[PDB]
Subunit: 334 residues, 3 copies
């Protein structure tokens, strides 16, 4: 193959590079020197390991295309990624649209995706709400309120607000109760086709541990709820829910075509399913997500339509190969 | 193949029709027109899609046998299903025995299956109980009581019962505490053989979301616990528990032979495992259940005995093929 | 093959014997007569079934090597296992080091594994602690304390301690809050190589059921929290956590070489992942664990490096075969 497939050594690089190997590509992992054994010894999936954060020159010399790891932006920064000379699989423009609260909200609104209602004024609260003090640090100080009077009492106790003037830039959001559900999609630019690749339930600490603690013992302590990502658990959905989940993906993709020059490759809608069978989305991740790591040997969904194991990583590699084969590599790269 | 395999477009039709294709059958999905893309585009498993609830005439013309979807009865009604001219995989008689509370209880009692003890008179309560007001609407108003005195105090508060005369037709049931466990079986009439196909943990809203909510925050709200089915999570059992789980299935099948003209094909016992390693069953589903949808590529149990991926859907198709091959199709149909 | 592979009929014998068959070995299951159908009919993986707890003479005549089942020691006793004339896969010396609290603590300390801090004197408590009354019977009477004053008040109420003299031999341990995570390793003596085989989340009753109970209903009852093993749920870790998890395994193995004549074959570190991404280990199981039973058809980790399904059971069988092939069987047996 002409191009080599390269990725940052974290998040889902094992899955991506394995998928790349399975499709006949030579592979490059780049990142921290202490995780080199992971990709070259314990799981030999990288033909080359470069011990640098972003070795632009070596990658250009190796004819690499970079497959954006889920934490690629977080380790390198949005500005550095946007100015990459090394070709990037997917649309670099989506990065600002998925990480900026307001752009993201507009994307989802245009895609007709059910999201939590935002309250600008505390006196407008008619249903239970979650309030998030700025600057939000992974659920730090988050509390619930049921009505305006309840809000102001808690604003006094937890924030020291005694006059309404003094309420300083916060977030008030409809509290949506449901089970976490993370659908994994892939949009093929080559085939102009959306797929559902897999679904997972993200596994988080300490939030998924507290359910093991008796109510009595929880109440004796002032506990700090946290949402650190630890791992991923495979799930399937109830079958009659798939169509709206897939249509949600179509609309997200369609809206991106009009807003940002398009969306292709892997993405995920992160939300909850309510008791009324509503899919409410908290975030879009316009990138591969760690939940896809379960499905190195395919998913209950890919085995519905392929005769072989297809991970999201392999699907990316298939897309790149197919683009080369049809002389349209440049169309899937930015 | 002579017959085509047909199913209602919901619940587990993807799995069933894929399994049918893998065994050399042509496939028919019938149902709502808006889910047609699911079975013909996103997961191309249906050769024919009929946009009708029950197109009896088209199905007879296509030489279809219907594989009962798990929600086939709920969408069509028991009377319509019972009077089908189109051949039905399995025993149509089991439908009343699994949905009527009293017939179901008799089935399980005859099969020697541990079930929750039912209390007819509130004054007989010696261990903690769950009380279910009629007509039961998915856990609406369900509460706990520990003794007769506790029951009557709560009967006053939550139901307005001030005289024992006024207690109007309710359900009082031993409260059984355990982890949800859903074994999936298949009984082959052709081979006169029971298999364990797979096991899952059904994923429900809002019940599986509340564990993520701190006790303190739960207490500020009067919350409504619900059990809407959202998806399914794969599990395996502790190995020493398999024998009693399998024997439970044998006894269920054996009792059906005496009570209703037999049970064959897929079924599931829905219950909990207590800390004392007791399997307590709340319901029998004498049909394929959605938990089997995880195992399109086989399960940790089928790979113990087959050299290829066997879903419950594929197993059904294998049964039908084997019946045709041995000239006994009529024995597995009603 | 010369040797046959034998195991006690429980815990993970299905997985082990299937793996043995897949690698060309004849198989022996021995144990209770009532579980014989499980290994010979429902999942035909045993060529021979001996209806005895430890039929030493028959096993020697059949040229068997025993693969230690996870509950092999619990059903037979450590002394009986230590004196086995039948060859045992792995190092029999590890058995005392993993089951004796003090030896285990030394092993983990030498391996540089983060464990919960132990408090000898209640007056040293500076962070929340869990206190375990002797003799510990699966979490019976376990309670929390936050400081010395809090401890003594609870020591009075729950244990009747009114004078500090009277405090009779108990356990006080740093309370570590995190999500349960069970990495499965395999160390090959033949290849002098550590692998990560799979990861699971053990499924326990009633602890994993209480999260489904509303805080309000939990408080009305004096509930007994239990940790009976029921099953296993597959997970994958966040990728950036794998290196420290694998290095933990290397250090455990390395420390065993110096302390007990080495560790080879399957083992597991049982612990939790905290919100700060710390892996805290409660126990080492220097044996195959039931969580590996999910991965009869491989795991998201084995499909990263093999072209075929590799369970821990199959991996054991591969090790034994490879030892025979390289004339070093005696090196992997004790
Ligand atoms: N409107 C809502 N209703 C119910 N639950 C919510 C809502 N918003 C967030 N949550 C839950 O609370 C958690 C906190 O996540 P949130 O997005 O607020 O911050 P974060 O992503 O953890 O950190 P940061 O915002 O700093 O990146 C979420 O993972 C989600 O499970
Ligand atoms: N005896 C019991 N002990 C403990 N938990 C129970 C018991 N019976 C039911 N439950 C739990 O409560 C939930 C309520 O289910 P239940 O069968 O009572 O109604 P449903 O099936 O949700 O709705 P419907 O009965 O209207 O079809 C069950 O899913 C089960 O988890
Ligand atoms: N230091 C700790 N911090 C937080 N949780 C703990 C701690 N120690 C144990 N636990 C939890 O409590 C449970 C009780 O297990 P523990 O090891 O104390 O006894 P056991 O193994 O269940 O029974 P036995 O000790 O009799 O074999 C563990 O499974 C673990 O989940
Ligand atoms: Na986002
Ligand atoms: Na039923
Ligand atoms: Na141990």
């Amino acid at each position: 193959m002409k191009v080599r497939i390269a990725t940052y050594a974290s998040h889902s690089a094992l899955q991506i590079l394995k998928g790349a190997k399975d499709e006949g590509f030579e592979t490059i992992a780049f990142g921290s020197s202490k995780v080199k054994p992971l990709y070259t010894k314990y799981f030999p999936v990288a033909d080359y390991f470069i011990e640098e954060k972003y070795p632009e020159e070596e990658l250009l010399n190796l004819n690499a295309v970079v497959v954006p790891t889920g934490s690629f932006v977080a380790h390198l920064g949005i500005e550095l990624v946007e100015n990459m000379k090394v070709p990037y699989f997917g649309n670099k423009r989506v990065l600002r649209w998925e990480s900026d609260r307001n752009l993201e909200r507009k994307w989802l609104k245009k895609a007709g995706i059910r999201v939590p209602e935002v309250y600008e004024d505390p006196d407008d609260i008619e249903k239970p709400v979650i309030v998030k003090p700025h600057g939000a640090k992974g659920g730090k100080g988050y509390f619930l309120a049921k009505d305006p009077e309840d809000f102001w009492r808690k604003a006094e106790k937890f924030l020291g607000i005694k006059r309404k003037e003094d309420l300083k830039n916060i977030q008030i959001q409809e509290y949506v109760l449901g089970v976490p559900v993370y659908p994994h999609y892939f949009y093929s630019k080559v085939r102009e086709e959306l797929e559902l690749m897999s679904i997972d339930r993200r596994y988080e600490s300490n939030v998924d541990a507290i359910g093991r603690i008796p109510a009595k013992d929880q109440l004796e302590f002032d506990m700090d709820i946290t949402y650190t990502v630890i791992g991923n658990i495979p799930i399937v959905l109830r079958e009659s829910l798939l169509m709206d989940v897939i249509e949600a993906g179509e609309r997200v993709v369609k809206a991106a075509e009009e807003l940002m020059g398009g969306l292709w490759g892997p993405f995920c809608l992160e939300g909850v399913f309510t008791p009324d069978l509503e899919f409410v989305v908290f975030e879009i991740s316009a990138r591969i997500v760690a939940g896809t790591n379960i499905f190195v040997n395919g998913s209950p969904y890919t085995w519905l339509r392929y005769d072989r194991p297809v991970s999201t990583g392999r699907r990316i590699a298939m897309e790149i190969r197919e683009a080369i084969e049809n002389d349209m590599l440049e169309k899937v790269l930015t």
